[PDB]
């Protein structure tokens, strides 16, 4: 009863009220629902007057709650230098750890309180402490990006090449976040510029992945491998064209990155840049000498997405206009399916096969009539599309246009010589599906063109 009245008052910070409870007979170290003593709540709010009277009148300075957090941990996380110095003078555990394994130096470096960092190190804090993740306080300082904490930790004896469970180094966290001020300092003290984590990524990989041109140039000046390969087989040039950082792509290429490097999937930077849609990067990769026709078919995915500018550049550098994929489908098929009039005009003008069929037997005119792209059907027939071609179901472009119900395209097909008398594998004609579905508008045109 009286103990719960103290922790409720210590949380509200009534200094004059608390001193009355401590003298009447309230337990100084009462257990909360989460097992937090009143000293915890006082160190969190930052009431220096309550913190001192608790320790002077006897209190648990090394108390551990249900999460493992100690009173010194709370004062180091919030950043109360006045309370931190009071706890340490009253016999606080300078190197305590919670359930995560975070020491007071870990939390102070992550939040970035340089005054609290220097006081803990001067009191006897292990600069190379490792938590459950295996990272030093320099890792937490490099991930957050505090320059002065990094300079202090390295001066006391931090491990510049510390490795955590995932294999990351302090240089990895700094290159992945984007703080060049600490990257140069880490490299000045002596960092492995080509460190490899469990995923095989180097600091140059994480830097080019985020887009920090300033860090990429600094890493390369300290001897970074421009063609490093990770577990996925991707170079820093892969990560650069994957995200589209033109400044990094141009720097890596001049330094000697391999524009034809293949990853585990089978993709060079060009297949990533053309898929992501970066006209600026695709032009630069092809100038240095990217293989425009490699395994992966970038012209297929480019014409499928609708990057008209990229499809033009790919063909202008010598891409195969009649390339084949897994389904033996040309890029003209996807362009006519997605309904891109401009790309269809570009592919056909570069020499696309207008009567090409896939494994199922569908031609670009088959796909264009099923979707209903009137503009594309017009252009395809102008280049010599087979108006009476059939697939494995025996369906002509007139068969598909009638089943989906496109009157304008049936008008164009008949103008180019569509055969209404044709039968499919079931025996039905173009006029048969018009009655099976229930469209008298389609039957009006078919019945006049069948006889004459």
């Amino acid at each position: 009863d009286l103990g719960k009245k103290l922790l409720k008052a210590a949380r509200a910070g009534q200094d004059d009220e608390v001193r009355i409870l401590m003298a009447n007979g309230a337990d100084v170290n009462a257990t909360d629902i989460w097992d937090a003593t009143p000293l915890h709540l006082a160190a969190l709010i930052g009431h220096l007057e309550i913190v001192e009277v608790l320790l002077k009148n006897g209190a648990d300075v090394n108390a551990s709650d249900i999460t493992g957090t100690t009173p010194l941990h709370l004062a180091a996380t919030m950043g109360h230098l006045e309370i931190v110095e009071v706890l340490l003078k009253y016999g606080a555990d300078v190197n305590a750890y919670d359930l995560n394994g975070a020491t007071p130096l870990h939390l102070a470096a992550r939040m970035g309180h340089v005054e609290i960092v220097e006081v803990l190190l001067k009191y006897g804090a292990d600069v190379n402490a490792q938590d459950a993740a295996g990272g030093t306080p320099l890792h937490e300082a490099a991930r957050a990006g505090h320059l002065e904490i990094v300079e202090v930790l390295l001066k006391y004896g931090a491990d510049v090449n510390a490795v955590d469970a995932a294999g990351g180094t302090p240089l990895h966290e700094a290159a992945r976040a984007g703080h060049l001020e600490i990257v140069e300092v880490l490299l000045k003290y002596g960092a492995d510029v080509n460190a490899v984590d469990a995923a095989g990524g180097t600091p140059l990989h994480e830097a080019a992945r985020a887009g920090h041109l300033e860090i990429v140039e600094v890493l390369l000046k300290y001897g970074a491998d421009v063609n490093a390969v990770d577990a996925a087989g991707g170079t820093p040039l892969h990560e650069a064209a994957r995200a589209g950082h033109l400044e990094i792509v141009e720097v890596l290429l001049k330094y000697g990155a391999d524009v034809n490097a293949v990853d585990a999937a089978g993709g060079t930077p060009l297949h990533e840049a053309a898929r992501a849609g970066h006209l600026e990067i695709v032009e630069v990769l092809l100038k240095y000498g990217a293989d425009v026709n490699a395994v992966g078919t970038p012209l297929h995915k480019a014409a499928r997405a609708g990057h008209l500018e990229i499809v033009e550049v790919l063909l202008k550098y010598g891409a195969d206009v009649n390339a084949t994929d897994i389904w033996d489908a040309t890029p003209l098929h996807l362009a006519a399916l997605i309904g891109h009039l401009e790309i269809v005009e570009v592919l056909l003008k570069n020499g696309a096969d207008v009567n090409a069929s896939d494994i199922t037997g569908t031609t670009p005119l088959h796909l264009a009539a099923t979707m209903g792209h009137l503009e594309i059907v017009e252009v395809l027939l102008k280049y010599g599309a087979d108006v009476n071609a059939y697939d494995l179901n025996g369906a002509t472009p007139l068969h598909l246009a009638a089943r989906m119900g496109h009157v304008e395209i049936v008008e164009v097909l008949l103008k180019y010589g569509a055969d209404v008398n044709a039968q499919d594998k079931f025996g039905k004609t173009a006029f048969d599906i018009s009655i099976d579905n229930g469209n008298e508008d389609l039957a009006e045109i078919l019945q006049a063109a069948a006889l004459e």
């Binding site: 297949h271 499928r304 199922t360 796909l367 494995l392 989906m404």
Partner: protein, 213 residues
């Protein structure tokens, strides 16, 4: 599954004989098509993501409507990624072409019907104030566009249909005749340009009788 059936019926009535794909949320994606019942694993569903290899989905056969079978497949949540062209291909047992489409997950959003529809008579001129809430457990609240339908009670009632601008969940209707029962219902869809899709089902109707001018 109980709500998936009601949602598939709305799309099938709009556009039969074609492959229909919809997503309640960006994470999931379901594609189905209604085909006439064959007494005779007949089809194979193939999908491909950006910078990823071709994979196959599990096909499910379910009979519905009158003498029809609805083949549907639910793509894995991990393979779904929005703002990416998804190439779909349905191939027959022999290798015949059934369907071929390239869709974007963010463009085939089918939201749920809105709830909390409340109609009130305004003291000014005799208008009606409608207030509704977005569909339950749906992200991107600020990007939902609505559409209310003012139906006339007697005879064929479809006099008024007002489009609501995205972000607001209430409107004040005007030009209603007195001594007439108007029934209201609100639609929902994801607004352009980053998101597209189809109109959702109508909310639970709310009827109100107007006084005499």
């Amino acid at each position: 599954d109980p709500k998936f059936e009601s949602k598939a019926a709305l799309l099938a009535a709009r556009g039969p004989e074609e492959l229909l794909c919809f997503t309640e949320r960006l994470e999931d994606l379901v594609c189905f098509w209604e085909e006439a019942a064959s007494a005779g694993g007949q089809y194979s569903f193939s999908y491909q993501l950006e910078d990823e290899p071709w994979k196959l989905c599990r096909l499910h056969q379910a009979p519905t409507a009158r003498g029809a079978v609805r083949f549907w497949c639910s793509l894995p949540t991990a393979d779904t990624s929005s703002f990416v062209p998804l190439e779909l291909r349905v191939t027959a047992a022999s290798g015949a072409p059934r369907y071929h489409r390239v869709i974007h997950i963010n463009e085939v959003v089918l939201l749920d019907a809105p709830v909390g529809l409340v109609a009130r008579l305004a003291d000014e001129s005799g208008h009606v104030v409608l207030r509704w809430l977005p569909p339950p457990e749906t992200p991107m609240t600020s990007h939902i566009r609505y559409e209310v339908d003012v139906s006339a009670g007697q005879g064929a009632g479809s006099v008024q249909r007002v489009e609501i601008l995205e972000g607001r969940t209430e409107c004040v209707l005007s030009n209603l005749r007195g001594r007439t029962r108007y029934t209201f219902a609100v639609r929902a869809r994801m607004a352009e340009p980053s998101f597209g899709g189809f109109w959702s089902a109508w909310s639970e109707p709310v009827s109100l009788l107007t006084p005499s001018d």
